[PDB]
Design a protein around this ligand. Structure first.
Ligand SMILES: [Cl-]
Ligand SMILES: [Cl-]
Ligand SMILES: [Cl-]
Ligand SMILES: [Cl-]
Ligand SMILES: [Fe+2]
Ligand SMILES: [Fe+2]
Ligand SMILES: [Fe+2]
Ligand SMILES: [Fe+2]
Ligand SMILES: [Fe+2]
Ligand SMILES: [Fe+2]
Ligand SMILES: [Fe+2]
Ligand SMILES: [Fe+2]
Ligand SMILES: [Fe+2]
Ligand SMILES: [Fe+2]
Ligand SMILES: [Fe+2]
Ligand SMILES: [Fe+2]
Ligand SMILES: [Fe+3]
Ligand SMILES: [Fe+3]
Ligand SMILES: [Fe+3]
Ligand SMILES: [Fe+3]
Ligand SMILES: [Fe+3]
Ligand SMILES: [Fe+3]
Ligand SMILES: [Mg+2]
Ligand SMILES: [Mg+2]
Ligand SMILES: [Mg+2]
Ligand SMILES: [Mg+2]
Lengths: 161, 160, 161, 160, 160, 161, 161, 161, 160, 160, 161, 160
């Protein structure tokens, strides 16, 4: 017991209310993106349907794993996520996805915009998150990298060169 | 030969009522999946881990269920709406509460909400079956799986 | 606005006593079939031993998965299964499997008869089950299909020309 | 105690009408698989790869389906005929054309071929269900799987 | 050179006493598996899920074990009897009770049932080892595996 | 310095009409074999049913993979396969598979004869194929090897002493 | 060779003695945590035994992978780890784990405390590690994230709400 | 304080020459069995060819794994195996496998006799092996168990009523 | 015995011409793999995803191809040179352009460069086969695989 | 029936001597695993990679071994102590040195320490076997596996 | 739509030309390392050939995944990679790999130097990359960690202690 | 239409000379596998582990190869002889020596044994190819695989 601490209770790192709020912002936009991605996945029609149909599911998988990561990171830091439908709809920054069947061209533009909005949220909170807890900023970097890759993989369809 | 002579052969298309009935199932499955994740993250207390894990299995089932229904709608020339505003405004599920919740409360809450989801499917079943028995089979898989989830979750709170 | 239900307690579907009894009938024949299938698997000897030995294990696997399906369906619908040895022996409708070694030809006939008996139980309760709960009848269809396939794969050894 | 005392208990035998109804399904599933491969090899043009790949998935499903139907026939002591001459002579599917075909044309042709196959299953469905509901469930799986493939393929040509 | 010149060399034959000793092990392993499933389905209450899951692991082990014993019997030209009537008539395990049972009760009941099964193996061990040490090693695997399951189950009720 | 070619358009190897026709001959016999293999797989009954039932499926798998190989080799070399039912029936060299159930012994002989016929087609076109394109002849060697192995595994049931 | 360096020997990045010492601190606490985790895994008894038994093994797996990561990172940077039992016991900051069987409730509190002590060590050295080598700080972030998740998954058992 | 041993050189368990010779006896019969098993696998023809063909390969797999186990156990205990063809032929106790094709019925009897012979060697050396090294006798028990299972699975083809 | 009496037995060694011929194949396979990755990253436009993915499959094939050839050289006592300066100075492939490129242009470009690579292999084939038929078989696998890639890629740009 | 009538049936419990003997094995397995990792990280020199890798395999074996023994103790109502202070104070293994060590030195060191570990198991074997043969089988697996590791490691330093 | 943005087009984060140039530097050295690694993998001979042969392939796998990561990160950020042979040869900082067979000892020294040159490039651009986009710096940290591990695993062969 | 009307079509029969040529390949592949194992067990010294491991990979390849050849014989109605006495009596490989051997010696010995095996395949190649080119392709796989193993093994002793 030469260097052994003798405390009965050793408490964990707790997130500030600001930090909790910042992760909550990321969470709702990740959930909204997952819901919009599925909507697009189902309703996309037209030239190169299959590629887009498939890529949109990969986007959804990533955004879902991301939302679970953020929410559980909140839990680890003694914060409380709210991923309920009403909260997501009321607080998401993503422009609304339109109803009905949409062409592959339209879906490419729509989804690129919504991914970019999501990435913007993460980029906006990044410095405040990093200042308080660099380990959480690393989770943000994974999200930024993965989502920006998805945006490139989707938007390239509409590029005329 | 017995070969048909039509250059174009069309598929079975669902009635508006049929599409509307699948839409009802869809929003309740999506809502259940969102509430399941909420519960999964925020459950605390005795037997946390079991409930945390089971809730993820519920969510997995509800998500594949929503996809199954939405794609069945698409196959039948109906158009699903799984957007957050639509889900929130049209789900029949009792609202799941915010904040940390005890294991016992989560068991009771989620059981009610699974039962609400099964009720929607059972309510639309006969109208769906009458128009398209193949879709009713998909409904049966959902009823079976969700009722299995209800049993696996609720049993925690059962006394003798 | 909101279609949300307001009850704090929504109950699940509860099977009638008759429905419970009907699934219990299926359950005991499936367990008995599993036990007889293993008996035959160990004790078969003669021409084409290996094929029958192997096929019998596939039958046992299917019947075991089936009994779990039925028993858990009972539990889901607030019915209580009884798969105990005494109950199975006292209430199964299958003819007893004979003792000791049996020839491949005899095992083929014996097991085919026992599958047919098991399927007959499922067919007998089907309409009453389907009328109360269509979703459970679908599980019965899976059992009927899978077992009648086993009966074909086993019986065909003895079918001539 | 409750043990039946007969030494031979017969299984369920399909009527010859039932056998013939499943035979109708079988030949169209086989024809669909062969046309599917023809399309898979010979498709050219804009979005070749997706179509090439999706067509193989259709063929996998149709081949599993023909196995399922033929084996169900055998289970009920009917006897399938999936020989080339029989399939050509009795399939209801319009002939697939020869030579290379554009992706747009293949989309339309294959959608029609899938729809014709589903139509056969839908046509025999009630007669099959009346004699054996367990077989009708297999038909439901086929209907669902095939109509999903029709949606996944035809969507390429959909303009909105 | 060192080649034996007899055309038929007989294998090791188990005595009928040895066969009977393995038969004792077999019926208790089968009874344990059936009681294990009964428990797995009918357990309710605090920590349901863990017990539900652990009980299935016990059943998997007991089923693999009964296969091992019955196949060892056959290898040595003994003939197993795992029929329901025989198992019910000759098992040494106390009967599992009917109906839903609390997790606490199931823990105690199943621990007792496992211990009874191990006791049978321990009782025949020396007689089995004396005739065939290779079979005794299979008994050792069973003892180790079953006592591990007893520990994993009973620990739930242990108060310290 | 640089060995780089300067053409903007380098064409691929194009098969002669004769070469295309030779691979077409192989293709139709492989498809016909696959169809007959399944027929036999469903309709075989009698002593050692299961082994033959299972082996026939392995044959069908090999023949199906083979037909895809040949058809795609045709496509690679700018030839156009025809695997349609009417063409296969009208142009296959295999004797017709008989209708209805057949005994294990008969299926063994029937299918062995049909494999032998399929291999004979491949052997007949081999030299002409090898002379134009050695790489395609190698694919033929794979087919010859794999099918003659199937013929051994199936025929040996009927071989005595 | 337009931008090619012409040095025969190009040396790697070497950790300072302070950096080596900082990683050594993390290493001993990760090893101590793995040893305490196993002790808890074996000796935990009581209500919800299985969940805790299983979670404790997941903790041990993570802490073991973590110690290997830290030690090998030391090796890469020309530092030398010491993970020997005497060194771990003499230099760990973790409060000693008690002997004998312990209740699930006690184990939850004990292990949460020990995880939190381990995380505290990583958090304490983080800034010095990051200042010298940001790539190693990223390995620390993985550890912080994974361990804090484990603490949440374990401690939640004892939460009364 | 410390129970640590102080020797810099601690030697391992070394087998007696007799022990080495006993394992060598097991080794050559296992290799011979593997070689004969393959011979039978290639050369069997007749009723139920496929089942025997397949089962013989499982026998060969088991016997090959067995020979490696024994040979490596020898190496561990400072004994030196000899698995060379000349040694195996000159010292195996198994009757020679006959040349050319053999019927399924004959292969069943022939291979069953050869397994019985292999097991008899293991049974003959068992007590002497167990007395010197119980851990090696356990490996023998695995061989006895696995081979006698193979003998059952193969011989049962020829067992009547 | 028929045992050979040589203490040392040497392996087949390739002629300088043979090694030179495999070297020619090697640099063109490496160049193709590097151009394939360039195209994979920089392709944009209609059907981007299909082409992006197919190009990775081409690269995978060319990389395993280069390894196969280089190691065959090693087996035969020849010494490969796959260094960047050597590849750049000695490849016969038309240079792949820098910057973003449309799907249609990438199809045409890569098809030409695959065909150039196949041409090298076909050009050395007879000299390789004459010296060592076993190596010609490796060449056949490369010809087959690359020509399959050419077909899968070029079909995108094919019109009716 | 042959059913036993006891409501409670107890399991086999180990003597204090037996628990003490397994404890002796446990600390030496844990010590070996810790020394194995030390060696794995700090080995340098000729054939580094082989030794680095083999040492991880040794560690894997010793860790699963320690778990096996500790859980066997638990099954038998004994209480393991695998804490660092206990391991350090009670292990019989010669101390592994600090700092980088050559491959040849690591081979010699680890071989000695494996042999020390095997010696503990062999020293307790007969007392363990006499009380509970099933546990002796677990000991045999450890002796076999560790002695295999000793051979695979030491062979590096063997001269002709 | 309470927090919903109402922009039709939301643009992504775009890398500066300096940032694009910095990632390009990393890319060419990763590709050069992969090409040199394979050259070494093929041509290494002598004492401990196999270990080095195998480790060199692991190095190549990592460097290849790394180059794909960097290039695609460039694409995501609207930069354009150039991984062509001429560009790699003209702009790599790695000392040239020698021609012909090389001893294992020489290869160890050569490859360690080339890995270290590659790591130096990443370390040199790190701060500028991190200042502009911390998410990309995290990708750099993965590369630094993985490559420095490879250098340790390779160089340790030549260490005399 | 194009259907052949004969009821029995014979397959390709190997001549007895062809059978004998494959038999030569078979015995050397078997001898190589047995010598490979001998080496694998008995190799000691510097870089033991790599050699131990590579020798097992050689044996796996040689065993798959002997199966391939024996099965090709059977496919063409030849009859293999892989019995120990036949292999010892007719193999062309120099005898592997008894006892422990250094890694350096094993490298040289095994390289020679591989080269002798390849030589047999190369010797029969043209006679085999003339009668059946499909079999010659299997010989090519063996040549390529074995010469790869020779390179991977001998490189250990190569000084440059
Ligand atoms: Cl795709
Ligand atoms: Cl089989
Ligand atoms: Cl769990
Ligand atoms: Cl290795
Ligand atoms: Fe229905
Ligand atoms: Fe269904
Ligand atoms: Fe149904
Ligand atoms: Fe060839
Ligand atoms: Fe940072
Ligand atoms: Fe990271
Ligand atoms: Fe960072
Ligand atoms: Fe033992
Ligand atoms: Fe050739
Ligand atoms: Fe080939
Ligand atoms: Fe023993
Ligand atoms: Fe054992
Ligand atoms: Fe989907
Ligand atoms: Fe279950
Ligand atoms: Fe294909
Ligand atoms: Fe081995
Ligand atoms: Fe390689
Ligand atoms: Fe454990
Ligand atoms: Mg596409
Ligand atoms: Mg058979
Ligand atoms: Mg629990
Ligand atoms: Mg080595």
């Amino acid at each position: 017991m030469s260097a052994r601490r003798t405390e009965s209770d050793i408490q964990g790192f707790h997130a500030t209310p600001e930090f909790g709020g910042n992760l909550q912002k990321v969470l709702v936009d990740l959930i909204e993106l997952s819901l919009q991605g599925k909507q697009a996945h189902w309703n996309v029609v037209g030239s190169n349907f299959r590629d887009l149909h498939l890529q949109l599911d990969e986007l959804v998988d990533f955004a879902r794993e991301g939302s679970d990561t953020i929410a559980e990171r909140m839990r680890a830091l003694d914060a409380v996520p709210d991923g309920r439908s009403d909260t997501v709809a009321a607080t998401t920054t993503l422009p609304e996805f339109p109803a009905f069947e949409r062409s592959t061209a339209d879906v490419v533009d729509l989804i690129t915009t919504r991914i970019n909005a999501t990435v913007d949220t993460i980029r906006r909170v990044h410095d405040a998150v990093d200042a308080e807890d660099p380990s959480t900023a690393d989770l943000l970097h994974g999200l930024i990298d993965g989502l920006e890759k998805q945006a490139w993989l989707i938007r390239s369809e509409n590029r005329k060169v």
